[PDB]
Design a protein around this ligand. Structure first.
Ligand code: CLA
Ligand code: CLA
Ligand code: CLA
Ligand code: CLA
Ligand code: CLA
Ligand code: CLA
Ligand code: CLA
Ligand code: CLA
Ligand code: XAT
Ligand code: BCR
Ligand code: LMU
Lengths: 41, 220, 312, 86, 227, 213
């Protein structure tokens, strides 16, 4: 599975994984901290 | 080829060496050339034998309860039609088993999984199943050259068919009865869907009124 | 014999070795990228199978398995629509009141204020009002339960996995030869008899036995919970012979060519159903019976292995 | 009864008509196709299929002509039913 | 190995008549490896001798006191007069110790043949061993050995196989009909056409459980039908 | 020539008969690379040891809750422990995280560099943390009876037994979870329900396991 993990290292799969992770992080931030307009805390 | 329906193309590779080769291959599925997957001749012969043996088990097992309750050896509680035995609960289900049909179905799952997967792994690796420990039973699971006829101490229990000619005779008889039973099982299902009665009931009703109790009157 | 199965065993080994090497399908892109145009050419030439090679056999095998992948994806999409109509829909509420309740099968998560998109569609539901018409199609099929949509979704996923297994098989394990694809007489005979002829015949059978009685009772004001289940309309012929007395005659009128007896569920009404605003399902059933016969006689036109028929 | 009615007579007549038309060289069969101008010429037969019949009538021949004659008889009986003749 | 179990068959390669009562049967191929063959021969001997004792006990108890059902004779309320309603736990303890000893000694005879042949308390008297499974000595006090050993071994093992079949027949007849062996024979000779395995299969007279001094033993049958 | 999970099927090339519990079971070829396979060996062993402890604890507490002693079931024991005793769950959780982080970071950086953790850095302890094999640390601390020492064949036998009981305990813990998800009662509750009526009381007669009927 060295070649399979090489495939998952390709640009589009890594971009999908990384942007899925980033979008999920921002989404969960916006769930647990709803409507963050300013830096008040 | 014999068995009207045979073709000149089939007789090129159908040379009578296979058990039950009557030249009937109008679709030409047993062509060795450019054959792969499950339409190779070996798998098709194997599946013929397996469908045959299972079907001639079933053709006796679908008719046996009815003819044994009609004979009076089994009671009328178990004298039921084969489709009303729990295989199709919509059609009917005998409730007097030792468990619900799904408990027994999982027992069947495990049992037949073991059996049929060992069978498969002997089809794939023919020398196999005589090597890995199976509680000492691997001595009878070495099989033979071919897959459909292992013929160990158990699968050939009485060592019937000592010679080659008698062995081919018995293979022919087995496969002929098996094809007959496959057609009989197809007929069992067909008469279950149309008539709704058991096969022995259909038989006695045809022998009671042949011209008014047949396929054509059962259309209404 | 001429028209027959002709395949090669294990043509292409199943490995991710060529997944790790992008551009493997061409001679120019396999060397690697130097400019960004390579990244675009890798995608523009991905399914240009007739430039990766010259032999029509390999192109044909690639095409066949690619079609299998497309079919698997279509099955995924269909199962997803059935599943969304099973879990995330107001379908069972819409069946009771289809003139008032808006068909919805897509619920939105309440994350950044997009819960406003979960509109008041009806049936005590909040979601996106779909416009694909799956609710009408399902009512016309005689669904009347979300469980049947659920199991149709699971069947669609099973069939999708089957299609993908089929593509892998017919490329890597047993791929057909060129002289198999080139039997266009057989392909047309089969796609006309069995695909469009037997498909319409089977759909006619469903329309006779499931859609027509279920929808006839739905149009008679019966609640979808108290309608007999389709298997009960299969086994108990009394229900059907109450709904259509020609079911009391069995399938004899077909084999006796007294087909007019079937004029209760095989009609030529025309126009629209006044209570639903759609075509009569008896009309569609007779339609599919008819075109099934037509396509099954049309699938016996070309010559494949027995001298009868036509050479295109 | 049905066996002996007009429908049954017409159907057996049409089926045996197509069969005796193919058997006696009056209809296109497996061994004898037609050209564009409908002249009976022989065929490649594309597999080769055996038959003990003196003319060479096959099971495929009887299946094809049974289907054709059944279409013919179905159409005829439902037509005579349609024009009120039946 | 002469005169096999069936005419048209061949003996296995590992059964050549070297052991007693070998008809070369082994259709399940279980005696293919020799250590398993040793173990299975020892278990055969054990099953055989215990089944001979079993049928002997049932038949003798049924003839000398037919009023006691052997299927329910294990219960303390059916035990004889000095042991009636005895505490079954202490009885089980007696049996457990006294049999663990002798059966571990027999197992050690299997594992190291000729190592537990000696009396471990009085260190002078040993038991010989012609083979494994046939100690002799104090276990053969009448001196029927030092003669036709293989012939007596064949007799022992054949009567033992027959006794195994016959005791499972006793058990099945007791579960189906609810009577003892000779009770069943007299009942079949009372009605040989209405009282047989016909119309008895499907009935199990065995209850679903018992209460032996507070416990609840599951009390199964060998096949379903009528509790 | 060696027992294999799927008989007839030959084992893959990376699964030689060197590791404990090697039956050729890698249909997904997950441990194809040797370093990944070492990582997965240690993962299997840690999972199986934690699952052996967990299964033994569940079994014991269920034994005590079945016979009538004051035991909560495994699905209720955490609440009972933090509520009966005045235990703060975040405090306890981060204490556990600190301790297990120390231990598992030591184990980690002995996986990445095997010779390490034995330089006397920790508290002077050198040979207690040297590590014998991958997943088998040994030493005076993780092996006070010295069973890896002395007899080697006994050590291989104990490795087989360890990994086999570990896979069995992992399956058992997954079964505990599934049975709580299905029957909602304790594991030995389910066992007694089975022993009462083996038929008619099993996974086929839940209503949730087989949803067909
Ligand atoms: C480019 C212009 C622009 C700007 C400046 C903003 C700005 C904002 N938008 Mg708008 N938006 C835009 C374009 C823009 N948007 C567009 C084009 C769209 C249409 C798609 C939207 C649609 C939209 C919606 C629908 C919503 C917003 C929201 C927001 C707010 C988000 C605050 C937040 O997520 O806190 C995040 C706070 C942080 C501190 C995170 C910073 C990032 C990292 C994580 C910090 C690093 C910390 C640490 C080291 C990380 C650990 C490492 C990790 C690997 C472990 C903010 C006011 C939300 C809102 O409520 O607005 C008021 C909201 O609901 N936007
Ligand atoms: C576009 C569809 C398509 C086409 C044209 C083919 C064509 C072919 N396949 Mg492939 N295959 C497909 C889909 C397709 N397959 C799918 C979807 C699967 C996954 C299940 C497979 C799995 C598969 C295997 C595993 C094998 C083939 C084989 C073959 C070859 C011979 C098939 C034959 O004669 O069997 C004729 C059909 C039968 C003998 C019995 C079919 C019974 C099935 C279950 C019914 C099919 C559905 C039915 C039409 C609709 C349901 C009706 C029912 C409810 C009443 C041929 C090259 C074989 C071969 O030679 O290898 C190349 C082979 O071994 N195929
Ligand atoms: C054409 C195919 C298709 C499409 C476009 C969608 C689209 C959607 N699905 Mg559906 N779904 C599909 C097929 C499809 N589904 C199938 C085949 C199944 C069966 C396995 C499901 C089962 C399913 C469930 C169980 C749920 C969805 C949900 C969703 C939504 C969010 C999915 C998400 O965020 O995933 C995230 C994906 C990644 C992080 C990757 C979205 C509207 C969710 C939803 O609508 O909730 C209200 C939800 O809970 N889907
Ligand atoms: C493909 C389309 C299709 C299908 C599947 C069905 C199916 C059915 N129709 Mg319908 N029907 C259709 C189209 C269809 N119909 C059309 C187009 C019309 C208009 C002409 C009708 C008009 C019609 C009427 C008027 C009636 C039916 C009836 C029936 C049922 C009786 C079948 C029968 O007697 O035939 C006989 C069929 C067989 C003998 C084949 C049975 C094959 C079995 C399953 C073989 C399998 C056995 C297997 C080998 C071994 C067992 C396996 C295991 C258990 C060991 C059945 C549910 C009747 C009914 O029940 O009404 C509800 C009825 O009265 N149909
Ligand atoms: C004894 C011989 C006989 C008789 C008297 C009839 C009589 C009839 N046939 Mg039948 N038929 C026969 C033999 C016969 N047929 C044979 C041998 C076949 C097989 C080829 C058929 C196949 C057949 C079909 C398939 C149909 C008929 C139809 C009809 C009826 C009306 C046709 C019409 O007016 O369309 C006149 C139509 C036009 C002038 C325009 C047609 C436009 C098309 C759609 C454009 C393409 C009429 C009752 C029709 C029917 O049953 O309708 C009730 C019908 O659809 N016939
Ligand atoms: C079918 C009856 C039967 C027969 C023929 C034998 C025969 C034999 N046994 Mg076996 N044995 C039997 C039943 C039998 N036994 C039972 C039921 C038990 C359990 C108590 C034993 C326990 C036993 C042991 C523990 C030993 C023997 C030994 C022997 C051998 C010498 C004794 C002898 O010939 O007695 C013949 C007896 C009879 C003809 C009388 C039978 C009927 C009485 C009621 C010989 C092979 C000894 C041996 O082989 O050592 C060399 C030895 O060590 N047997
Ligand atoms: C294939 C062999 C077979 C099988 C599977 C069964 C299976 C069964 N029989 Mg039947 N039975 C058989 C042969 C068989 N019987 C024969 C050959 C005789 C004689 C009987 C006489 C018989 C009786 C008398 C009774 C059963 C009963 C039963 C049930 C419980 C035992 C079960 C459904 C019992 C039942 O439930 O009814 C019952 O009372 N069987
Ligand atoms: C890693 C596996 C594991 C885990 C997470 C737990 C977790 C737990 N066990 Mg269990 N247990 C296990 C293995 C495990 N046990 C094994 C292998 C045995 C044997 C037991 C025997 C056991 C008993 C007999 C009891 C627990 C109890 C407990 C609870 C509190 C323990 C406590 O007070 O800390 C103890 C902390 C120290 C001793 C300081 C160090 C907790 C739910 C107790 C409880 O109330 O839960 C039912 C309890 O009475 N366990
Ligand atoms: C099932 C499981 C893993 C199963 C893995 C499988 C099948 C892997 C299969 C494969 O990968 C291989 C091998 C090879 C691949 O090519 C193919 C596949 C098929 C992919 C792990 C369980 C792992 C399970 C573990 C670690 C369980 C630990 C349990 C503990 C600690 C329990 C603790 C408690 O229960 C008590 C004791 C008391 C309570 O009060 C408190 C709590 C905490 C609830
Ligand atoms: C042996 C012999 C003989 C006889 C024989 C016979 C008698 C035969 C018959 C045959 C036949 C008698 C056949 C038949 C066939 C049939 C068929 C084949 C059918 C088919 C059908 C179909 C195909 C259908 C279709 C359809 C439908 C379903 C519906 C509507 C539409 C249509 C019509 C399309 C003789 C002379 C004596 C002598 C020598 C030899
Ligand atoms: C792939 C095969 C396609 C060919 C079509 C056959 C498909 C079979 C689908 C399952 C049908 C099950 O249902 C079928 O059995 C019932 C019970 O015997 C039959 O029931 C009918 O016949 C029986 C006796 O006449 C009685 O139950 C009833 O009077 C009547 O309802 C029906 O004829 C049919 O509804």
């Amino acid at each position: 599975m060295k070649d399979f993990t090489t495939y998952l290292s390709t640009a589009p799969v890594i971009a999908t994984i990384w942007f899925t992770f980033t979008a999920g992080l921002l989404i969960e931030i916006n769930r647990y901290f709803p409507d963050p307009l300013v830096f008040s805390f | 080829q014999l068995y009207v329906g045979a073709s000149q193309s089939s007789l090129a590779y159908l040379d009578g060496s296979l058990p039950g080769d009557f030249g009937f291959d109008p679709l030409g599925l047993l062509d060795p050339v450019n054959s792969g997957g499950f339409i190779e001749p070996k798998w098709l012969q194997y599946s013929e034998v397996i469908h045959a043996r299972w079907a001639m088990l079933g053709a006796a097992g679908c008719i046996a309860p009815e003819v044994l309750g009609a004979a009076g050896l089994i009671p009328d509680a178990t004298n039921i039609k084969w489709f009303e035995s729990g295989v199709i609960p919509p059609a009917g289900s005998y409730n007097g088993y030792w468990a619900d049909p799904y408990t027994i179905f999982f027992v069947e799952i495990v049992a037949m999984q073991f059996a049929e997967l060992r069978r498969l792994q002997d089809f794939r690796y023919p020398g196999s199943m005589g090597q890995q420990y199976f509680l000492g039973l691997e001595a009878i699971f070495k099989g033979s050259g071919d897959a459909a006829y292992p013929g160990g101490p158990f699968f050939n229990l009485f060592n019937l068919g000592k010679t080659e000619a008698a062995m081919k005779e018995l293979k022919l008889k087995e496969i002929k009865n098996g094809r007959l039973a496959m057609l009989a099982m197809l007929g069992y299902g067909a008469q279950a869907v149309m008539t709704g009665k058991g096969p022995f009931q259909n038989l006695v009703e045809h022998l009671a009124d042949p011209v008014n109790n047949n396929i054509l009157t059962n259309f209404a | 014999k001429k028209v027959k199965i002709a395949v090669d065993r294990n043509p292409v080994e199943t490995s991710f070795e060529k997944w790790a090497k992008p551009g493997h399908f061409s001679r120019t892109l396999s060397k690697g990228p130097n400019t960004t145009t390579w990244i675009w050419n890798l995608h523009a030439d991905a399914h240009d199978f007739d430039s990766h090679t010259s032999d029509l056999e390999e192109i044909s095998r690639k095409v066949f398995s690619a079609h299998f992948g497309q079919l698997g994806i279509i099955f995924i999409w269909l199962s997803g629509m059935y599943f969304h109509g099973a879990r995330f829909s107001n379908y069972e509420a819409w069946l009771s009141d289809p003139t008032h309740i808006k068909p919805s099968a897509q619920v939105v998560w309440p994350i950044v204020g997009q819960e406003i998109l979960n509109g008041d569609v009806g049936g005590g539901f909040q979601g996106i009002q779909i416009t694909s018409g799956f609710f009408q199609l399902w009512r016309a099929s005689g669904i009347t339960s979300e469980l049947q949509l659920y199991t149709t979704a699971i069947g669609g996923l099973v069939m999708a996995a089957a299609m993908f297994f089929a593509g892998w098989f017919h490329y890597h394990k047993a791929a057909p030869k060129l002289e198999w694809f080139q039997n266009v007489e057989s392909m047309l005979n089969h796609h006309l008899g069995g695909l469009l002829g037997l498909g319409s015949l089977a759909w006619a059978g469903h329309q006779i036995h499931v859609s027509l009685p279920v929808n006839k009772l739905l149009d008679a004001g019966v609640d979808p919970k108290e309608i007999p289940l389709p298997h009960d309309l299969l086994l108990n012929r009394a229900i059907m012979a109450d709904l259509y007395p020609s079911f009391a005659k069995g399938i004899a009128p077909f084999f006796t060519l007294n087909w007019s007896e079937y004029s209760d569920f095989l009609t030529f009404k025309g126009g629209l159903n006044p209570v639903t605003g759609g075509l009569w399902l008896s009309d569609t059933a007779h339609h599919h019976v008819a075109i099934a016969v037509l396509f099954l006689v049309a699938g016996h036109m070309y010559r494949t292995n027995w001298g009868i028929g036509h050479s295109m | 009864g049905f066996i002996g009615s007009s429908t049954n007579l017409i159907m057996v007549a049409s089926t045996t008509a197509t069969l005796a038309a193919a058997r006696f060289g009056l209809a296109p069969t497996v061994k004898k196709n037609t050209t564009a101008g409908l002249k009976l010429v022989d065929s490649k037969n594309s597999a080769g299929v055996i038959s003990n019949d003196p003319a060479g009538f096959t099971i495929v021949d009887v299946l094809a002509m049974g289907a054709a004659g059944h279409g013919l008889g179905v159409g005829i009986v439902l037509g005579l039913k349609g024009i009120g003749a039946l | 190995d002469r005169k096999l179990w069936a005419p048209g068959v061949v003996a296995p390669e590992y059964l050549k008549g070297d052991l007693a009562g070998d008809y070369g049967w082994d259709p399940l191929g279980l005696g293919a490896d020799p250590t398993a063959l040793k173990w299975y021969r020892q278990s055969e001997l054990q099953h055989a001798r215990w089944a001979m004792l079993g049928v002997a006990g049932v038949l003798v108890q049924e003839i000398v006191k037919p009023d006691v059902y052997f299927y329910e004779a294990g219960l303390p309320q059916n035990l004889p007069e000095p042991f009636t309603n005895i505490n079954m736990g202490g009885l089980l303890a007696w049996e457990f110790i006294l049999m663990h000893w002798v059966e571990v000694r027999r197992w050690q005879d299997y594992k190291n043949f000729g190592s537990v042949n000696e009396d471990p308390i009085f260190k002078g008297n040993k038991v010989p061993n012609p083979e494994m499974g046939y100690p002799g000595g104090i276990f053969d006090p009448f001196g029927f050995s030092k003669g036709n050993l293989k012939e007596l071994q064949t007799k022992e093992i054949k009567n033992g196989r027959l006794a195994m079949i016959a005791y499972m027949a006793f058990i099945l007849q007791a579960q189906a009909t609810g009577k003892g062996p000779l009770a069943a024979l007299s009942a079949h000779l009372s009605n040989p056409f209405g009282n047989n395995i016909l119309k008895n299969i499907g009935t199990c007279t065995v209850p679903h459980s018992v209460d032996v001094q507070g416990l609840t033993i599951p009390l199964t049958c060998l096949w379903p039908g009528s509790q | 020539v060696r027992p294999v999970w799927f008989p007839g099927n030959p084992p893959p090339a990376h699964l030689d008969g060197s590791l404990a519990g090697d039956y050729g079971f890698d249909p997904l070829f997950l441990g194809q690379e040797p370093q990944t396979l070492k990582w997965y060996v240690q993962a299997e062993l840690v999972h199986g040891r934690f699952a052996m402890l967990g299964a033994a604890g569940i079994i014991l507490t269920s034994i005590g809750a079945k016979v009538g002693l004051g035991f909560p079931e495994w699905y209720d024991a955490g609440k009972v422990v933090v509520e009966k005793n005045n235990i703060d769950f975040p405090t306890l959780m981060v204490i556990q995280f600190y301790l297990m982080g120390w231990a598992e970071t030591k184990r980690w950086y002995d996986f990445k560099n095997p010779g390490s953790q034995a330089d006397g850095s920790f508290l002077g302890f050198t040979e207690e943390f040297k590590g014998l094999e991958n997943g088998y640390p040994g030493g005076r601390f993780f092996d006070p009876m010295g069973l890896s020492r002395g007899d080697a064949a006994k050590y291989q036998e104990y490795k087989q037994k360890e990994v086999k009981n570990g896979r069995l305990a992992m399956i058992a813990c997954l079964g505990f979870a599934a049975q709580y998800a299905a029957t909602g009662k304790g594991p030995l509750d389910n066992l007694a329900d089975h022993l009462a009526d083996p038929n008619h009381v099993n996974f086929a007669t839940n209503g949730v396991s087989i949803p067909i009927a």
